[PDB]
Design a protein around this ligand. Structure first.
Ligand SMILES: CC(C)(COP(=O)(O)OP(=O)(O)OC[C@H]1O[C@@H](n2cnc3c(N)ncnc32)[C@H](O)[C@@H]1OP(=O)(O)O)[C@@H](O)C(=O)NCCC(=O)NCCSC(=O)c1ccccc1
Ligand SMILES: CC(C)(COP(=O)(O)OP(=O)(O)OC[C@H]1O[C@@H](n2cnc3c(N)ncnc32)[C@H](O)[C@@H]1OP(=O)(O)O)[C@@H](O)C(=O)NCCC(=O)NCCSC(=O)c1ccccc1
Ligand SMILES: Nc1nc2c(c(=O)[nH]1)N[C@H]1C(S)=C(S)[C@@H](COP(=O)(O)O)O[C@H]1N2
Ligand SMILES: Nc1nc2c(c(=O)[nH]1)N[C@H]1C(S)=C(S)[C@@H](COP(=O)(O)O)O[C@H]1N2
Ligand SMILES: Nc1nc2c(c(=O)[nH]1)N[C@H]1C(S)=C(S)[C@@H](COP(=O)(O)O)O[C@H]1N2
Ligand SMILES: Nc1nc2c(c(=O)[nH]1)N[C@H]1C(S)=C(S)[C@@H](COP(=O)(O)O)O[C@H]1N2
Ligand code: SF4
Ligand code: SF4
Ligand SMILES: [Mg+2]
Ligand SMILES: [Mg+2]
Ligand SMILES: [W+6]
Ligand SMILES: [W+6]
Lengths: 653, 653
């Protein structure tokens, strides 16, 4: 029998209203583990490149990680996968909370949606009971608001609900899916969900979930908890607060945001304010945050409590975590009070807290320059704050100028013209990046910006420190108990690495060292997004409780399959290449893999070419970014190599 | 991980030439075991009643039993299922030999064909490699002949081949599938295969097949091999050799056919020859058999060697077992030399050995009577023997009157008319029966002739004795060591049974007694056809090694699921009802459940009514043969009851 996984999925046709439970192939588990990996397998051989994002044949997959529903601490992530309406590439999005584990308790590993529903509806799951309900009375309702009404309707107080706001219903290219203190935020997956007339997905589960090696599996679980205690008694020395400990960026706990407000760019990723964090500002923000934060809350089976309930006066309560705390504030040249109030509106609407702020600031720059006229913004209010609330409503409704801005900075500038493309200066593969315009070229981050399939920098980094220690004693101390490294050489790299001089960036670490680092950091994220493990306890923070050495044990004891360190490394490489192959088939080439032209002020073309060339070699790809026939056959992806040749993507010989 | 079964099937669309391996649902195994069981499930919810047998939507399935490819002695049966072109009902047909086990070693449980290939093809399976080959150079070739050329083409001497003959290609309604010394013979499965344009299925396998509890399973295997040694040293006293030991009827060993020739109707189930077995006949048949029989051969993993390679002077070699040894002979009022000769042609042509002889025999009665003219048989030889060879050619080619006769006796008489219906007197549901026209009504066999879904009396009988003993001492001796009975009450039945007196047929055994006997006998067959076990070691002979008490142990140790006598009983009841439900949906009713009008000289209309009334009650059926909503709900077949009501077959309460 199957373990960790349930071995079953739901196939839903929203056009015919048909529902079907189908057993999964156990071979898929051995090759692609689960979550993102198996999502990639499904999208590959069911979604050909001729399928458009808002086409009925486009798929919307809700996947619970392999180890979700087990006692594994923090393992609770949902992986939503589809074809992005913004980037035209694959879009996988992660969501925390309690939804994924509930699905497992209901008896399912995934839910795959195809076609479209003519009427607004939501899916109701209660163990073996599955049905489609009408949701017309929920039209326009906010994401969180929607969940509460449903749980009253069905009389299921303990059901978990993933819903879309008005933004998703109106197919905003950066619309999200909201569930309590969790969000599948990026990729426009909310736009696809709305396009299919799917207002929400409600699931309740009370079945058992089994593991293969009970005693052994709980042993590793306790080993993690013990490490979390010890780790939280020994934070990383001389790092900032929101990087010393475990979990997601603890921005709800720490009031200090000097690193953020003085190193990140305000507005449309435009302005840098070196001396913003004054005493008056630090006190005003701490007061606002103490009054707004009700409680620090956690996800399922996790003690880190990264999120927080936010209560602004005269506004409904919503939940928040990580960097969305500042994006609306910094993009509007305002304060933390404004940011918390508009984030409430945006979370209910279901918008990406990264792109949305940059799109609105992008619009005001165009209005400032004169590329957009005041006639495009009728009835526009005077205040800077009021203008953001104004433009926010225009976007979610796709009203007038809001209809164009609802497509993202790339497509909006494309349609606007008149030099609007010049102000879309912060995109990679048509996707907005973090507002960061640094001085000196970073050889490690350059690679992560160019090749990251998530196209987000915060979701590929983690395991290697972002900066070197000034003193050698500090490095020797760090590498002392750095048991998470796959190889001793990662310790030796950090020892030699210095902030200034003959061993500083961009010329050090070397090109070969950078490639190895990027490959390791990326590998841990892909393992996380297949197992369902929150990165906060794994691939994100320094020296995590989960790593390349005990992960194989969790899989073996949990799922009952043969798994070791090397076999796991190869597995992660397998469906990370498959994801790559999916984007190749959709027209992605080396040309698309370049950072923004103004991302760094000091550029080194010859070093950057050597970096991307060497990294491709390590991955086993072409000098155009395409996985060769040799590496594909070696990975067990022969059917990919055949289709590449047949499609002319790869040449025979 | 799955056990005994491989857990995969092959989905092949012949019209599109697509090949696909699909993991199965382990719940189907729990409810329907496998083989014939799971095949019924597949046909039920994929082949609705509006589908024609020669429609491309009709399915042809090759299933290997649950315990095929395991060390279990005699377990190697293939189960072919489809919708019969002759009866318009469900058709399942069993084939022995070496084919099923081979499929298991390749890594598959079933092959499921849909659609029609426009050109003659065959499927080549070698482990993970599966491809469709052009087979136009094989057109017209015989089943066995086709096999040898194919194996040489592929350089695969250890490959197993199931093939159709010309008869299958020309969609003769009783065309068969031949696999060396084994054949799927009845129902017209060869017709559907030819109709789809499938000449053969070649399979080679070299993969491991695992069992769950090794030590316990091989222990069970050793228990059977012991019982076989002891059974062969103790044949059932006062029973003729062919039916006094294990295996299929050993007619290839025993020359003595006094019982058959003097009790079975020669010709068109017409002539009883009470004193046919003379000294001169016996010596002649003995001489022919001794010179013809090259060697007694077995199936995979069995020591009984029921088969015999037959070599007639001037003819190629073929394999034969059981009763075809007499059918062609008796139908033509000929001898054994002719029988063995023509049966070589018939086997290579791919024809059923029960119907062909009766069909040809039926035609000559119509010619003798006047309904058919010499004009219908142009080029008709003068000799009896030469006429049968002539009409055999006409049928396989569907040439002239061979087109009409190729549809069977039921439809032939329907189309011929002019009173030809009267000579189609040996039918049940448009399916030719054994040439048996006894004197006194047998209550036990009456119920079997009416309800058996195979519609063939020899594939439902077995566990209970066909006749009583003259002496009580004989009865007491037999029931002393009769461990295979499901209850003690069977022992008491046999003891009371007498050939003459108050305790003789038709009045004894009683109606309730007769029902319990038919139920037991039928149940054992369905377990065999699901597991893949040969009836010659189970449901066919008296006191077999496999039985209702040790069968659960095999299923548990073999497949690794829970099982016991009562669960197994109900499990067999579940998919016997399912098969019953499939034919009810195709229009079958009580009216169709009647033996030939002249099957018994002495009839008892009132007893016959009570007999069937009672049997329907034990089954849990209506007074019209249809399974009640209750028993369907009780068997976990709730989906069936719903559709029945929806279709109006069952009144809503
Ligand atoms: C200190 C760094 C490492 C880089 O900041 P800086 O120190 O400012 O580095 P700079 O490149 O600006 O150069 C500084 C000055 O020194 C100069 N100079 C430089 N090198 C050299 C040299 N070798 N030799 C000599 N001089 C050198 C250089 O010319 C410049 O001087 P000028 O003004 O031009 O005259 C850190 O702040 C960082 O974030 N980096 C990681 C990358 C990243 O973005 N990761 C975060 C992803 S988001 C995330 O994780 C998150 C988001 C939300 C929520 C949660 C999480
Ligand atoms: C002896 C029987 C039991 C029946 O044969 P018989 O003895 O002839 O039984 P009858 O019914 O013909 O009557 C005889 C005479 O006695 C008379 N009479 C009868 N009852 C009574 C009474 N109670 N009281 C008084 N008198 C009674 C009756 O009137 C008649 O006298 P008349 O001439 O009319 O004046 C046996 O031969 C048999 O095969 N039966 C099993 C059923 C079957 O067909 N199974 C095989 C399936 S194929 C197979 O397995 C296989 C095929 C190929 C390869 C391998 C396998
Ligand atoms: N497995 C996994 N966990 C992850 C992440 C991820 O990308 N993969 N992202 C982290 C970051 S940067 C944030 S801001 C939060 C957001 O969690 P959410 O998806 O529930 O909103 O998740 C964290 N946990
Ligand atoms: N509306 C909204 N957008 C959001 C967030 C959020 O909490 N709400 N979280 C941000 C954070 S912290 C992260 S790490 C990314 C997570 O990426 P993903 O949700 O696409 O996997 O989304 C960002 N966008
Ligand atoms: N499981 C099972 N085994 C069975 C049978 C059957 O119907 N089911 N038929 C028996 C009989 S009567 C005969 S004659 C032989 C025929 O073997 P064949 O189908 O390979 O020609 O199978 C024997 N074994
Ligand atoms: N061509 C051919 N027809 C045959 C046979 C055979 O061996 N070859 N077996 C006969 C016997 S003895 C029996 S019991 C049935 C078996 O039925 P089935 O093979 O359709 O399951 O087929 C009959 N027809
Ligand atoms: S580390 Fe934070 S975001 Fe991750 S599971 Fe724990 S509480 Fe949730
Ligand atoms: S008993 Fe006879 S027919 Fe059955 S498997 Fe053994 S040899 Fe073959
Ligand atoms: Mg998220
Ligand atoms: Mg057969
Ligand atoms: W983040
Ligand atoms: W037989």
């Amino acid at each position: 029998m199957r373990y960790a996984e349930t071995g079953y999925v739901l196939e839903v046709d929203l056009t015919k209203g048909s529902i079907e439970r189908v057993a999964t192939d156990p071979r898929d588990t051995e090759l692609y583990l689960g979550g993102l990996g198996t999502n990639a397998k499904i999208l590959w051989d069911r979604v050909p490149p001729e399928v458009e994002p808002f086409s009925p044949e486009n798929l919307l997959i809700f996947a619970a990680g392999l180890l979700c529903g087990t006692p594994a601490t923090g393992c609770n992530r949902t992986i939503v996968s589809t074809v992005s309406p913004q980037t035209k590439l694959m879009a996988f999005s992660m969501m925390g909370g309690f939804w994924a584990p509930e699905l497992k308790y209901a008896g399912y590993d995934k839910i795959i949606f195809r076609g479209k529903s003519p009427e607004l509806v939501y899916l109701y799951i209660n163990n073996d009971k599955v049905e489609i309900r009408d949701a017309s009375h929920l039209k326009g309702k906010g994401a969180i608001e929607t969940a509460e009404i449903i749980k009253k309707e069905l009389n299921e107080p303990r059901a978990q609900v993933a819903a879309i706001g008005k933004a998703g219903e109106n197919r905003v290219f950066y619309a999200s899916i909201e569930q309590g203190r969790s969000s599948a935020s990026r990729g426009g997956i909310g736009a696809v969900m709305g396009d299919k007339g799917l207002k929400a997905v409600v699931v309740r589960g009370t079945k058992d979930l089994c593991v293969a090696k009970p005693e052994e599996y709980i042993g590793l679980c306790n080993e993690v908890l013990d490490y979390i205690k010890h780790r939280e008694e020994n934070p990383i020395p001389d790092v900032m607060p929101i990087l010393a400990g475990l979990g997601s960026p603890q921005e709800m706990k720490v009031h200090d945001e000097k690193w953020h407000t003085e190193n990140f760019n305000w507005g449309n990723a435009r302005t840098r304010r070196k001396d913003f964090w004054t005493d008056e500002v630090s006190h005003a923000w701490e007061k606002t945050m103490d009054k707004a934060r009700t409680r620090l809350i956690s996800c399922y089976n996790c003690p880190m409590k990264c999120g927080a309930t936010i209560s602004m006066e005269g506004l409904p309560t919503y939940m928040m975590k990580c960097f969305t705390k500042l994006t609306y504030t910094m993009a509007a040249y305002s304060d933390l009070d404004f940011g918390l109030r508009i984030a409430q509106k945006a979370t209910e609407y279901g918008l990406d807290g990264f792109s949305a702020p940059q799109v609105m600031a992008f619009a005001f720059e165009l209005l400032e320059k004169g590329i957009l006229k005041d006639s495009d913004f009728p009835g526009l209010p005077e205040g800077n704050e009021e203008r953001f609330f104004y433009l926010l409503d225009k976007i979610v409704n796709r009203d007038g100028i809001g209809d164009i801005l609802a497509n993202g900075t790339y497509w909006a500038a494309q349609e606007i013209g008149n030099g609007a493309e010049d102000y879309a200066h912060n995109n990679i593969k048509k996707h907005e990046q973090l507002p960061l315009k640094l001085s000196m070229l970073n050889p490690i981050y350059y690679l992560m910006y160019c090749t990251g399939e998530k196209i987000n920098i915060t979701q590929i980094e983690g395991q290697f420190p972002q900066a070197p220690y000034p003193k050698l004693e500090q490095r020797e101390a760090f590498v002392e108990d750095w048991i998470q490294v796959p190889d001793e050489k990662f310790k030796k790299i950090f020892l030699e690495w210095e902030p200034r001089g003959e061993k500083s960036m961009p010329n050090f670490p070397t090109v070969d060292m950078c490639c190895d680092i990027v490959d390791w950091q990326e590998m841990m994220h892909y393992i996380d997004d297949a197992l369902g493990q929150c990165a906060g306890l794994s691939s994100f923070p320094l020296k995590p409780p989960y790593h390349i050495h005990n992960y194989p044990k969790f899989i073996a004891a949990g799922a009952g399959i043969e798994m070791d360190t090397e076999k796991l490394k190869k597995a992660a490489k397998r469906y990370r290449t498959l994801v790559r192959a999916f984007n190749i088939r959709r027209g992605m080439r080396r040309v698309d893999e370049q950072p923004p032209a103004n991302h760094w002020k000091n550029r080194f073309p010859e070093l950057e070419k050597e970096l991307l060339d060497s990294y491709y070699k390590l991955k086993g790809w072409n000098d155009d970014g395409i996985p060769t026939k040799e590496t594909l056959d070696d990975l067990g992806l022969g059917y990919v190599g055949d289709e590449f040749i047949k499609r002319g993507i790869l040449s025979a010989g």
